[PDB]
Amino acid sequence: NNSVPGAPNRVSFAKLREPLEVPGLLDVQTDSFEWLIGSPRWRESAAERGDVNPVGGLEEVLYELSPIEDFSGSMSLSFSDPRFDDVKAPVDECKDKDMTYAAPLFVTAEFINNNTGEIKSQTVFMGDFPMMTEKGTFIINGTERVVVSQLVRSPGVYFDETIDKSTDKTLHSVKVIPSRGAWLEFDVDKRDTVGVRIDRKRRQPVTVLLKALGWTSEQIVERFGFSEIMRSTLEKDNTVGTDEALLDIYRKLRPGEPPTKESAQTLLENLFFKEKRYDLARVGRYKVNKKLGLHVGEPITSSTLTEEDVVATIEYLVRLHEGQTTMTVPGGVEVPVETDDIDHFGNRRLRTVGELIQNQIRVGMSRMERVVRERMTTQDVEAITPQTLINIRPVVAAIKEFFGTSQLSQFMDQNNPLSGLTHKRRLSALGPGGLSRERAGLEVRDVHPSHYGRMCPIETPEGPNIGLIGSLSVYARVNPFGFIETPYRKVVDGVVSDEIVYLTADEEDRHVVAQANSPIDADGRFVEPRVLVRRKAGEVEYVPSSEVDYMDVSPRQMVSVATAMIPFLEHDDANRALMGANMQRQAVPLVRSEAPLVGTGMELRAAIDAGDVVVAEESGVIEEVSADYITVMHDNGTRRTYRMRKFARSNHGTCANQCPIVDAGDRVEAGQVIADGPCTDDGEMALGKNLLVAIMPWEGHNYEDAIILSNRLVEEDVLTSIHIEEHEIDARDTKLGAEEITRDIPNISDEVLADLDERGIVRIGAEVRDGDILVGKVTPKGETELTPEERLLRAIFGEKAREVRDTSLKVPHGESGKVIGIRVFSREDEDELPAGVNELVRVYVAQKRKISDGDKLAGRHGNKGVIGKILPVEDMPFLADGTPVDIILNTHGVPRRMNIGQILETHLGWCAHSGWKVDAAKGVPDWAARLPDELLEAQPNAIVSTPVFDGAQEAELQGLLSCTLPNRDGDVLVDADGKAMLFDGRSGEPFPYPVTVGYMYIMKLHHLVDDKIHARSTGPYSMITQQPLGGKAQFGGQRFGEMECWAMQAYGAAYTLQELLTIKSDDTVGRVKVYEAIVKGENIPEPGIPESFKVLLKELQSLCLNVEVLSS
Amino acid sequence: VTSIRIDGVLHEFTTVPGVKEDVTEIILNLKSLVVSSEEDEPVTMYLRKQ
Amino acid sequence: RVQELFEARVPRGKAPIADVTGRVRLEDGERFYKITIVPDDGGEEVVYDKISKRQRLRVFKHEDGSERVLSDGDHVEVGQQLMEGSADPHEVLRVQGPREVQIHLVREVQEVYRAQGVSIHDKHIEVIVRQMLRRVTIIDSGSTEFLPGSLIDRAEFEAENRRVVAEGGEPAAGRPVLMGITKASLATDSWLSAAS
Amino acid sequence: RVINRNNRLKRLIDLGAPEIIVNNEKRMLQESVDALFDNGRRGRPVTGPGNRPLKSLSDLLKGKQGRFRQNLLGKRVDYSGRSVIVVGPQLKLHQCGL
Amino acid sequence: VNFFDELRIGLATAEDIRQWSYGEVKKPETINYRTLKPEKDGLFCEKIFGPTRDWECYCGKYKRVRFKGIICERCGVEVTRAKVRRERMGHIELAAPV
Ligand SMILES: [Zn+2]
């Protein structure tokens, strides 16, 4: 059932079949942009989904704006039908040439003059648009960008309920939150004053505004006769009269203004019926209509609040106060009456990139149309043209600044394809337009019974942003409004239905959802009469096998993409599983990757959709292949070529390459991988290698999470990685002159510049050591001069007649390696450069790092560690057949952390590596009844896969471990339990007891040791603070916190603190004298007065406060 | 083997037209080569295939 | 809890206290407990109008058992809490002096720390409480320059009082009082640290 | 501002003028010195950019960036170094590996 | 050298400020916007605080290193390291008490 053509074959412990393949993992990201721009494919998809009105994003935003007009009504403008054009240049050049992948858009604007009756219509240019590539990313200025979705509370009506501590009576509060406008709060209180708070005003009785509209008092009485408390309020109000009511409302809203009937009458419609001032999203209107069951039969077109909505809301509130279960309104079907919850996914919508870009372009359009309307009103009416009206600067500036500074525009982390995919699938909850860290409640960070199937509960950042950053589920798809959905198959009469439907939160709550793992007969008959089920909220209980309505699709319907590829996830702990999931997103691409021996079946699919692996479009036959490019011949006679980037610096400093895995003369079918990117092996993810592990404390070198590695890994490049640095220098013009890169440099020996070429740059392929010169340049000197008279003089004379300083770029502190390539941009060659620059050159330095001491390693079960020591290959313990182990793990950390899953993973890995053959001559053993018939016979170095929540059981492992194929020597190493006899490498005698061994997948984290190690004895000093610089790159000293001062005081150590505060941080003469004394044999002179104290003095003397010293 | 010399190539992080794998892969493959030395001085070999 | 204890604010529990030793004459109000104690030597009854939502604590008897209920008509020792909670340090200080409040604070902090299982020596807490309660509020200045109601350390107040008395000037009437860490640290002798 | 206003005062008194303008200008000068020794102490603080209050002379002492506090947060020292730590069982108690 | 028995804060006086400073600023002009040099007696003039560079007279008459604490008559400046610029002050003169 391998959907892709030529994926590697790896039989799986399959017991249940999923009736649908995993949907396009990046479809969610691309669909928003496709809807926004508007394409035939999106229109066809929308028509298939059944939506009556196919409406794009640009068309909608710039159609709801038009027709603009002047207040006099003698002029108007309209413009619709936005359309796009082709690309400027391919993505490769745009990324390499520093350009921006974009495309122009043209809008056909029609210019109509009312009083005359003329039409002026022609195309208009409206800037460029940052188009989205096929991998769901934005290329801005050559740097990758990815926008993350956001979680917002859908605009609507929420019925809150707070219990009084003294009265102990229910107070039902209803609050409406539209997209923009006034907020209405109707709350029944102990005093019974059912009032309103329009724009955080005083609680004015609802009846006052109800009558302000002219609502007849008799209609109030009859429609509220069933209500008793509200009837009491009606009998309690004093002011009566439409004019009096509206004037009182106006005074409460705007006091101190001429109270007139017309003013209040116009303000009512302006604040509640003027669409521009008061607007709600179509999602909000639809949700409110569904909540009240009013206006359900028609497609929402008007997006303004209506009076019937308000009267229905107050009726609902009073009925809820009465304690009724369900309420009905004329024209509305029966619906339940209950309070709403903020943390329910039936209210929290999802705004994709489409919504954000639409809002930004809406702001830009508003800014443009304001000036356009002002210009048309003020400009001459005769020879005015739309070309002269439309201004393109505001919209382009808005989009540019949104892409640049908006917090929702983050660099796409590209340590490995999995990290990029996770970032593209991320669900942010903070940032602009959202709650802050301090104001956000702690409860929102907890799980909700409605999260099942929509947001993974495991994957989450470890830092303080816990619970605010989730991830889509495997099968989750966003509905066209923004409410996440989840597939389900509906049971009609106790028989499973192959056909599936998608349900949202509200509909899911209103139905009965079965359990996927519940046994089901092949004919669709429920073998068990009682099947567990999930209910409204936090309720699970067995029910007859008939009333059940819905059933899930797969057991893996609630896990994230990252968490979906952690074997034996049903045995670890929540914290450990989360830690492992977070660790999986920090691997480092190695040089020679190997696919895992044990891993879920969602590896190849997660790699094909990652975009970092090329794939043929049409089934053709390869003519020839090369390390740099490939040429495939289509069956239609069209030759096509694919170019593969080799050794290009990744967005996070790692390397990226592609190696074709195809041979010359093979008819490659469409959809078959052709090249493997970083962290890949035959078109499937591979973030690490396979090492033979042993679990036993060894001389305390593996004490407290430490790790020991055999030198075989070091000397075989098993865990060798490649890291590429990047440096750049620029020569920008100055008032004193222009700097130029030149090979020559004042007062430098020939040896120092022996590497620079004629043009003034280091030759490619030349080794560079720390402190070496990387590119030379000369900085002119400052000499006062005449602007125009000496400018004439210097043009004709005085050439190179003043001085030049040296400011050449040098390798920072702690870098080395080869020089792989040099990129130079020149303004002469007509290359776009930032303003005020002439020559910007960047140099790439690539260094090969071998795993060493102080390096982090961690498996897929979240068990970090450090390389305590790398013993020689001749010292590690070895099996009875002479096979030395490669790594030793401690045992005390397994049961306390409670991550027993890794033990099972190691056992299964050993079983798969050694190969097994289960006896079947006498028949299938009872423990092997459910094993797939093709999984009973394996080969050495076989591949196995255990899907999450459905894998080999304990009995399966027990049986398999008892039938492993013997070694070529004829003997079996491990026992049935899985332990084995070792031999000490030092003593040479066997250990008294057996130990566990096996192959476990090991990754490599990004927290290397070379970055951390740093020293500083004497170096550059800051000029403004007189303190040493900071940071490893700047070669600066370490910080000295105040807690250290407290500790030093605690010991009573005085002279040490004096030195630390005076003689090594501030005192200039002190530093010079102590350095000279150390250079010689003289004793260190006592420190002096720190610069801080003298600065404090000379500063406090500036406030007329005579600060004496009183040395006496 | 101690050190190699590839004509027309200046360093190891690159490729060479006509081959299917880059310089790093061929270095890794050559690491498996096994040779026995009778002389106690650096000797030189050649590998010409077109 | 430790923060509140050291800060010496109004206890949240605010348990009733035995201001005087006498024969407890308590009438149990189901809404608000009313507590009165007849003095043994003589005098009036101190009246407490406490909230009745709690469950009365042990009465001080020869057995001295926690299971016992607060029995009316018994006798209690001065300063004892009548019900569970925490006694305001100011009240116990004014009615007992500094030693009792010092030992009570030390015992309370030690108890809360041992609740978690950690152990620390008492002297580390004595060194702190010694500084915390080293202020003598003054009600009247009389023959003294300092403003009445101004905090003065005990040593300097005593020195000035003895100096003024030795010359015949009337003494200044002042009493000891404690404060929280913030107020105890905000008032110092060196101006530079205060500015810091 | 202060120097400019003082020079305006000097020039005006040299030129000669009635009492009102002297005083009006003097009141102005008094405000500038008060502002310089402290901005926002009393009245509307002066704001040039983005309606942002300016950092007066007295602001060098109060606040988190006040020079008093910053002398206690610590300084960057020389002869330092940081690195990862790995347990070593081959060392005596009064020993360490560098 | 480093003996500070006590520290007392006294309230200064006009004569005290006269004593402390070494100049009397007169113009608000900052560093020149063209030649990037202080203006005559401006807010940075070397005649007040000290030389912009170390051991460098304004006019170049005493620009040799062999001049410590020496005043140039041509430009009326002193010759000492740039650090001295950090420890000398200026006092403005007021035409009206404040
Ligand atoms: Zn001079």
Give the residue from D6, D26, D37 with the most E CB atoms within 10 Å of its CB, the best one to mutate.
D6
**Contact check, Cβ <8 Å, D72/C196:** yes
The one-letter code for the residue type at C154 is R
> Which 8-state DSSP code applies to residue A523?
T
Cα separation values, A67 from A37, A54, A57, Å: 21, 21, 17
**Contact check, Cβ <8 Å, A1108/E35:** no
Residues D57 and D32: their CA atoms lie apart, in Å, by 13
Residues in Cβ contact with A961 at an 8 Å cutoff, skipping those fewer than 6 apart? A907, A911, A974, A976, A977, A978
Torsion of CA A678, A681, A687, A689, to 10 degrees: -130
C-alpha of residue E77 to centroid of ligand 1, in Å = 6
Residues A555 and A947: their CA atoms lie apart, in Å, by 9
Least Cα separation, residue D66 to chain C (angstroms): 9
Count of CB atoms within 10 A of residue A402's CB? 21
* Contact between A762 and A754 (Cβ < 8 Å): no
**Contact check, Cβ <8 Å, E2/A1089:** yes
Which approach determined this entry?
Answer: cryo-EM
The string of DSSP codes covering A53-119 is: ----HHHHHHHHHPPEE-TTSSEEEEEEEEEE---SS-HHHHHHSS----EEEEEEEEEEETTTTEE
Instruction: Enumerate the residues of chain E whose CB falls inside 8 A of the CB of residue D9.
Output: 95-96
**Contact check, Cβ <8 Å, A1030/D60:** no
Q: Which residues surround ligand 1, an ion (CB under 5 A)?
A: E 57, 59, 61, 72, 74-75
Q: Which of A410, A409, A404, A373 is nearest to A390 (CA)?
A: A373
Tokens of A253: 């809203």
- For A1060-1104, the three-class secondary structure string (H helix, E strand, C coil) is HHHHCCCCHHHHHHHHHHHHCCCCCCCCCCCHHHHHHHHHHHHHC
Report chain A's terminal Cα–Cα distance, integer Å.
Answer: 95
Alpha carbon of residue D75 to chain centroid: 20
* Contact between A777 and A807 (Cβ < 8 Å): yes
Which helix H or strand E contains A349, and what residues bound it? strand A348-351
Residues C42 and A314: their CA atoms lie apart, in Å, by 67
The string of DSSP codes covering A407-436 is: TT-B----SSHHHHHHHHTEEE--STTS--
Partners of A625 in beta bridges? A630
The answer to whether A238 faces chain E, any CB pair under 8 Å, is: no
Residues A831 and A833: their CA atoms lie apart, in Å, by 6
The one-letter code for the residue type at A431 is G
Residues in Cβ contact with A617 at an 8 Å cutoff, skipping those fewer than 6 apart? A640, A670
- Locate the DSSP E strands across A574-686: 620-625, 629-634, 639-643, 648-649, 655-656, 659-660, 667-668, 675-676
* Contact between A1024 and A1005 (Cβ < 8 Å): no
- Locate the DSSP E strands across A492-609: 501-503, 530-531, 543-544, 550-551
State the pairing for strand pair A689-695/A887-889. parallel
Pick left, alpha or beta for residue C68 (phi over 0 → left; psi -120 to 50 → alpha; otherwise beta): beta
> Which 8-state DSSP code applies to residue A369?
H
Q: What is residue A367's three-state secondary structure?
A: helix
Q: After which residues does chain D have a break in its backbone, defined as C to next N over 2.5 Å?
A: none
* Contact between A1068 and A1026 (Cβ < 8 Å): yes
Tokens of A748: 């430098």
Residue with tokens 């993992």: A25
**Contact check, Cβ <8 Å, B11/A820:** yes
The answer to whether E9 faces chain D, any CB pair under 8 Å, is: no
Q: Which of A380, A381, A389 is nearest to A122 (CA)?
A: A389
Chains A and D touch (3+ CB pairs under 8 A): yes
Pick left, alpha or beta for residue A777 (phi over 0 → left; psi -120 to 50 → alpha; otherwise beta): beta
Q: Which of A778, A783, A784 is nearest to A805 (CA)?
A: A778
Tokens of B8: 């027309």
Touching C: which chains, 3+ CB pairs < 8 A?
D
Residues A679 and A421: their CA atoms lie apart, in Å, by 13
CB contact residues (below 8 A), chain D span 34-63, against chain E: none
The answer to whether C193 faces chain D, any CB pair under 8 Å, is: no
Report chain B's terminal Cα–Cα distance, integer Å.
Answer: 23
The one-letter code for the residue type at A493 is D
Residues A676 and D2: their CA atoms lie apart, in Å, by 71
Tokens of A779: 């900085």
**Contact check, Cβ <8 Å, A626/B11:** no
Q: What are phi and psi of C60, to 5 degrees?
A: -75, 110
**A723 burial via Cβ count (<10 Å: 0-12, 13-18, 19+):** buried
Least Cα separation, residue B49 to chain A (angstroms): 17
Count of CB atoms within 10 A of residue C125's CB? 18
Partners of A773 in beta bridges? A810
Tokens of A332: 């509305």
The answer to whether B32 faces chain A, any CB pair under 8 Å, is: no
Residue with tokens 């002479």: A882
Residues A127 and A396: their CA atoms lie apart, in Å, by 6
Residues A220 and A229: their CA atoms lie apart, in Å, by 13
Residues recorded for chain B: 50
Residues D85 and D94: their CA atoms lie apart, in Å, by 16
Resolution of this PDB entry, in A? 4.4
Instruction: Enumerate the residues of chain A whose CB falls inside 8 A of the CB of residue B14.
Output: 646-647, 820
Q: Which residue of E has its CA nearest to A1104?
A: E12
Q: Which of A181, A369, A357 is nearest to A275 (CA)?
A: A181
Residues A737 and A797: their CA atoms lie apart, in Å, by 15
Alpha carbon of residue A957 to chain centroid: 38
Touching E: which chains, 3+ CB pairs < 8 A?
A, D
Q: What is residue A502's three-state secondary structure?
A: strand
Residue with tokens 């008061």: A278
Which helix H or strand E contains D28, and what residues bound it? helix D19-37
Least Cα separation, residue B47 to chain A (angstroms): 20
Give the residue from A1039, A1048, A1104 with the most D CB atoms within 10 Å of its CB, the best one to mutate.
A1039
The answer to whether D56 faces chain A, any CB pair under 8 Å, is: no
Q: What are phi and psi of D89, to 5 degrees?
A: -85, 5
* Angle between helices A27-37 and A57-65 in degrees, nearest 10: 40
Instruction: Enumerate the residues of chain A whose CB falls inside 8 A of the CB of residue E36.
Output: 735, 782
Partners of A691 in beta bridges? A1000
Count of CB atoms within 10 A of residue A12's CB? 18
Tokens of A1067: 């005192």
User: Which of D37, D61, D80 comes nearest A1038 by C-beta?
Assistant: D80
The answer to whether B29 faces chain A, any CB pair under 8 Å, is: no
Residue with tokens 């970032």: A423
* Angle between helices A57-65 and A353-378 in degrees, nearest 10: 30
Cα separation values, E95 from A450, D15, D25, D30, Å: 76, 14, 12, 11
Tokens of A988: 């040479």
**A314 burial via Cβ count (<10 Å: 0-12, 13-18, 19+):** buried
The answer to whether C195 faces chain D, any CB pair under 8 Å, is: yes
Least Cα separation, residue C196 to chain D (angstroms): 6
String of b and e for E30-60 (b: at least 16 CB within 10 Å)?
eeeeeeeebbebbbbbbbbbbbbeebbbbee
Q: Which residue of D has its CA nearest to C192?
A: D68
- Residue E45 known to bind ligand: no
Q: Which of A281, A318, A310, A279 is nearest to A294 (CA)?
A: A310
Count of CB atoms within 10 A of residue A154's CB? 22
Give the residue from A790, A1063, A1106 with the most E CB atoms within 10 Å of its CB, the best one to mutate.
A1106
Chains D and B touch (3+ CB pairs under 8 A): no
State the pairing for strand pair A486-490/A501-503. antiparallel
Touching B: which chains, 3+ CB pairs < 8 A?
A
**Contact check, Cβ <8 Å, C195/D69:** no
**Contact check, Cβ <8 Å, E6/A1110:** yes
Give the residue from A657, A681, A719 with the most B CB atoms within 10 Å of its CB, the best one to mutate.
A657
Tokens of A179: 């997209």
The answer to whether D21 faces chain A, any CB pair under 8 Å, is: no
Residues A179 and C138: their CA atoms lie apart, in Å, by 62
Q: Which of A334, A421, A312 is nearest to A26 (CA)?
A: A421
Which helix H or strand E contains A361, and what residues bound it? helix A353-378
Residue with tokens 């940032």: A431
